[PDB]
Subunit: 121 residues, 2 copies
């Protein structure tokens, strides 16, 4: 049917609202990193969570578990960096608006960053 | 005392969750690497990534891992939900519970690889 369509690697603005401590809070872009079967399921079941990697414009010092996302490739306003150490499963109701998608190269390094952060090698 | 290491089970406070997100307080498995974890211990504050656990084991998906009560410190058999993975502030940690077995941790690694499309 007309279920929400959503693909790994897409950049969506999401509402993380009420967070504690150093958690990414408020509103920010985030990269979808859950696989696409789960992504379709979370919209047909409508009882769904998807997993995303939040993004910040405070680039500063970049760590090997973070990926630089260029404003030109992604449709973002400014350059940003995906923080694999902020990975979070979100209810689909936190999805606000699609912004774009990362490049294949960016997504591949994001996989590397996730494997480094979660020790999955 | 934030001395959490990978594979350990901690009671975490998942307040302010929305929708189908794991909520309330519950056990969770630390899955962030131990160098990040040790950084958090050393500074006394940080973020750690956990896999929330539910006692509802009515059905087990391939991205979920049944954890046995007999070895983990959990009162009953539970399941770890890779699709609920979540980076939490250290202030959400209430207390330590126990530790998954090595086999359970490796199974959780496979479930995380499946859920996140990491091959």
């Amino acid at each position: 049917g007309p279920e929400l369509v959503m693909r790994r690697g897409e950049i969506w603005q999401v509402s993380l609202d009420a967070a504690r401590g150093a958690e990414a809070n408020n509103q920010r872009p985030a990269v979808v990193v859950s696989n696409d079967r789960a992504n379709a399921t979370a919209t047909r079941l409508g009882r769904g969570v998807i997993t995303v990697v939040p993004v910040t414009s405070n680039i500063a010092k970049v760590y090997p578990f973070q990926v630089l996302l260029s404003a030109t490739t992604t449709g973002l306003q400014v350059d940003c960096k995906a923080q694999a150490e902020q990975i979070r499963s979100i209810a689909t109701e936190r999805l606000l608006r699609p912004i774009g998608r990362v490049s294949a190269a960016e997504l591949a390094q994001l996989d590397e960053a996730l494997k480094l952060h979660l020790d999955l090698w």
